[PDB]
Every structure is written in structure tokens, then in C-alpha cells.
Amino acid sequence: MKESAAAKFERQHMDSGNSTYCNQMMRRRNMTQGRCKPVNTFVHESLVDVQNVCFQEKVTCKNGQGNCYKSNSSMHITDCRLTNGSRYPNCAYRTSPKERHIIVACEGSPYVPVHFDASVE
Incomplete structure (x- = not known):
């Protein structure tokens, strides 16, 4: 692969360094390429903490x-949700910061996160 599954996961869902956050991030992370991805979550924890969810x-x-794992700890995340019926090329999102357990799908060797599945209160 030219972009590994693990790299795709980081691109789509990780942002441990950090109103218009989602508008910028969905665009910069290539999730508004000809289609506005309707829902997407970013995780503000270290990549090592997210990778450990796989165990x-x-x-x-x-x-x-069956390859999904729910974190034992709550994590700081941000949900981005497409709003006002917006369509490419004018994707508009709402930004929702929260603290939830996350659920990721894991695959490979080493066994690492490849999909952000959901979050749980």
C-alpha cells in the first residue's frame, strides 16, 4: 500500500497536539475530497495510548x-458532524469536544488501530 492502514487511521483520527476546528481539520485531513464525510472523530490522546486500546x-x-476494542479509560475527543445539509464543495461542520470511551477496530502485526468505530459515554 501507498498509504498504510495505520497511517490512514492517524490521518483521519489523531490530533494529540490540539468553532472552525472541524471545518479546517476535515479539509486538511482529506475528508472533504469530492464528498463531505458526514461524521468523523478526532482523538486528543497520545498515539501510544490509542494504540493500546487494541489490547x-x-x-x-x-x-x-469482531475486531473492535473499547478503551478502559475515557479520552478527550472531538466529533465533527456535517451540518445544514451542506454538500461538496461547501462542507460545513459542527465541532463537539467531549470525553468518552473510544472503540477502535484493530488489525495487522503489530496489531494496531485501523478504524475509529464509535465512542461510548
Whole structure:
């Protein structure tokens, strides 16, 4: 692959360094390329903490596959949600910071996060 699954996950979902946050980040992370990705979550924890979720609580994924893991700890995340029926090329998002357990799908060797599945209160 030209972009590994792990690299794709970092691009789509990690932002440990940090109203218009989602508008900027969805665009800069290539999630408004010809289509506005409707929902996307960014995680503000270290990549090592997120990678370690792959050894936490096994749970079923939203698509029904079994390789999803729910974090034992709550994490600082931001949800970006497409708003006002906006369409490419004018994607507008709402920014929602919160603290939730995250659920990720993991794959490979080493076994690392490849998809952000959901968050749980």
C-alpha cells in the first residue's frame, strides 16, 4: 500500500497536539475530497495510548465484525458532524469536544488501530 492502514487511521483520527476546528481539520485531513464525510472523530490522546486500546475490552464493531476494542479509560475527543445539509464543495461542520470511551477496530502485526468505530459515554 501507498498509504498504510495505520497511517490512514492517524490521518483521519489523531490530533494529540490540539468553532472552525472541524471545518479546517476535515479539509486538511482529506475528508472533504469530492464528498463531505458526514461524521468523523478526532482523538486528543497520545498515539501510544490509542494504540493500546487494541489490547483492552473486546467488543463487536458497528459493522458486526469482531475486531473492535473499547478503551478502559475515557479520552478527550472531538466529533465533527456535517451540518445544514451542506454538500461538496461547501462542507460545513459542527465541532463537539467531549470525553468518552473510544472503540477502535484493530488489525495487522503489530496489531494496531485501523478504524475509529464509535465512542461510548
